[PDB]
Subunit: 239 residues, 4 copies
């Protein structure tokens, strides 16, 4: 009742599996009408079936956050059938490609965030929640990319929060640690063992434990939290 | 056998400095979520006021006198709670110790962390036995408007973060989480008193354009205490309306 | 022996972008003072000429060149020209709804120049890349937002590039100035300066020279184990 | 019996010598980092008082100073004791002058370790501040601990000590800045000491894998940074912690 999102529309990107899907189900559990997105029509349909199977109202759709056209078209569709999303959740490697990876990720956050801000500004209320990437990839390049993406996400989140706060729109981030998903489940055992050894709690996190934090941030009780990045990592801090 | 999101039914919670403001709002929020709540104060009148507040809101628990600077007060208070209510598995540290100068920070931080440590170590034994716990440390609000106020606030906040992260690392294998909540400018007795032009300027450093309510702090505490926050540990959650000063 | 171990820059070529005034010019003179051959750059021919005159007047060998760090072509052409006529720069100092584009542009420029100069440093197995942050630009909320964002981007970028190139004995550091005495701060009403000074423990503005001295240290052999760091030069005034 | 005060015994004018005979107090100067710091400040022209907790350490410091042509002394000092600190500083003031450069390098486990270390930094810092305030000039430089051990306990202690040092340094800087006294810290990473020199090669290889520069730092590389912070060119640097870790960042 206190935690309720009844009457809200929520847009969760990348909702067809793992953390995105858990987030979609948690906001649904709390009463939101949920629009979950995937990059394929089959993913969108899977989202709609998942939603239905858990008794959550809303829809799956196709969204490419790298495209201005996909973003404008998708928001127009949502406004036409439902209304304005006021909760929006944005959800080896090489040694040298950290720069393009971060740059792309932040350009996508920015693109979607700016597009949804018009509606939140009209409503004088909003929640933007950015989900960082999960710990996992191998060696020095993986560590470099993780730390860079996390620093980008924190600084971006703080700045956007300063820019939009006078409108009663909060902007926060959740930075996960080593979370049990399809992408971490079949990491080489030795890499997994070593990651577990760096975690005080001595276990992987669950997607649901990320989603609970997102659901708190989306609620009215988190209205004075903004510009924050909440680490959800079992005490494993990697800079 | 119940199993609900956010529920603290069956838990005993100890909230230090619970007679007013943030501490009292925290005590009521944990009560709202089903905890048996023990709130503490350094005086018998503060303890009575806590008992009355709890009773008036239909929260089971007690108000007790506790001096966190004293090993004897800490052992006595825990023994009493164990006898009459059970082991506190949720512990919220909100107790801390003319105009303010920038030379007070050392003794203030030193005293506060020594007390956090004393209480935390005492309650860990029960949590270790239960293989479950929540320790939540509340930071101090911005105490004055100028440079001295910033210095003292930034020092206390840096101490609290580092302490919190370290203790979390020390106790995590036992499924005990240790987190902190760092308020910014909260509507309390301090803010209520200052000049109107000075208020306006204060609000101008806060992106949300308003003071925080004690209740907004308490809601964050209540989340951290829940099962859903089980993989959050070592964290400091800023609750400051976007006003970041270090 | 204890008393003779070079912390001078004789025999090095240094490239200092945005060298026509203020901080960039002081950095160019300090590296010159320490013995480097200095190429300072500006975006205009007039700025380049001013740099050449300033260098000549202080007895520093090098040149003033035109360089636009936002352009791949200007960057490749200018380095090729430097390699032909002076040698490979092994010390490179980057000094040249709004916050997002500003940070994005700045980091794209740092990345472009850094990658271009890394080839020569890799060949020499030695280098110094030093990024200069922006001074506190403006007084209000927008200024704070822009300043903190640019600083956070600079720090993360700096740390990541340092990790990428460290095995080659190339260090990558940043210097983050606070309030510095420049054309910006000179124009403030006399009283508004007093209020600004009240937030700075040291009670004064920094000098361009004080930024330059820190750069000159980072460039030296004694700073060889410092990488990935951002050195705040702000008189104790910290804002994030 | 034990003598606690040992002078170094010490016409070339070295280009390096800019600290002009100013007096520098370097605690924990008998070996490793402390000793390199003492030599570097000597190289830059300071009169250097290095301290150790034993008379034999103090004598070793005096010999090291003498052998490098540095003017100053080795003294006994216990930074955990108010009495040792007051007595030693009074002695220095009488016999050598007010130290205007002070380098603090002498320092369930993490809490008591950090607490003790900060209390020592505070005690010494407060004691030397009167002389700096009179001179309207000073440098206080705090040296963090090296990465002490390989596992979780080592990481907890290291991160806690570092976070305490940074927050303390910034707060003290704010407190003493209006007097033109700077307060900074240097946070080392993995440094080549007697301890690290003798680890099994497979353990050393794995350690080096976490350091982008691919090597241990030298004590001298810490000292150089301290020396820069002590100079007039670092006058607008205060409240800062300079990491010196080859790109290895642990929190
Ligand atoms: C673990 C991590 C940090 C700290 C600690 N202690 C302090 N402090 C202690 N006593 N006086 C000041 C601090 C004072 C100012 C700023 C940060 C501080 N941090 C202690 C344990
Ligand atoms: C590695 C580490 C960090 C960043 C990065 N990029 C940004 N950013 C990028 N593009 N536009 C803004 C940032 C914007 C605001 C605050 C911090 C930022 N950090 C990039 C690489």
């Amino acid at each position: 009742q206190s935690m309720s999102l009844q009457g809200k529309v929520a847009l969760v990107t990348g909702a067809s599996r793992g953390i995105g899907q858990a987030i979609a189900l948690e906001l649904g559990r709390l009463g939101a009408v949920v629009i979950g997105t995937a990059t394929s029509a089959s993913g969108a349909e899977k989202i709609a079936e998942t939603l239905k199977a858990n008794g959550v109202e809303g829809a799956g759709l196709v969204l490419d956050v790298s495209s201005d056209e996909s973003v404008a078209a998708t928001l127009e569709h949502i406004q036409q059938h439902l209304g304005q999303p006021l909760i929006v959740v944005n959800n080896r490697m090489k040694d040298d490609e950290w720069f393009d990876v971060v740059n792309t990720n932040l350009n996508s956050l920015y693109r979607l965030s700016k597009a949804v801000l018009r509606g939140m500004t009209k409503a004088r209320w909003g929640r933007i929640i950015n989900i960082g990437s999960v710990v996992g990839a191998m060696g020095n390049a993986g560590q470099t990319n993780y730390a860079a993406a996390k620093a980008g996400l924190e600084g971006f989140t703080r700045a956007l929060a300063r820019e939009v706060g006078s409108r009663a729109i909060t902007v926060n981030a959740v930075a996960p640690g080593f979370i049990d998903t399809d992408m971490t489940r079949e990491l080489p055992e030795a890499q997994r063992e070593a990651l577990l050894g760096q975690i005080p709690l001595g276990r992987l996190g669950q997607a649901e434990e990320i989603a609970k934090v997102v659901g708190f941030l989306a609620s009215d009780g988190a209205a004075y939290v903004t510009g924050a990045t909440v680490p959800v990592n079992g005490g494993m801090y990697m800079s």
